[PDB]
User: Fold RNA-dependent RNA polymerase from Qualyub virus.
Amino acid sequence: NIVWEHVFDNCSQANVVFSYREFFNKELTLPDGNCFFRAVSTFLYDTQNGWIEVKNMCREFAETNWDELPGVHQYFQDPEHYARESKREGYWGGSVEAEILSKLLKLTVIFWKCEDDVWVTQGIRWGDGNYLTAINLLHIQFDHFDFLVPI
Assistant:
């Protein structure tokens, strides 16, 4: 059992050390700048090939539900600013889209930080759920995300 500490809006955080293979199997995503969206696409569609649809749905939720996205507001002026920056191909996904997707899909999203391919040393969570029901991502160096499936 894990103690989540509230950070901001629907975002919380946990310092915790564990072997991620103790609780997860990993699925690698293609190492390009779309890796975040490929990991979410795997969760949603059981293939990484739908990363473009994940980018689209984030943009669309930003335009219809801008009022609900204070973490996105920290970095982008309005939905059009978000849409322009995310439509470029060297756009890297991350905590902005984890907030969007947690609220669009009514799901919990968790980044598990791992720097040696063995030990997780930190979790960051959007939503109130536990990891069994969450989109779990392995966040490693160079802003790469792989997908984690709970055992």
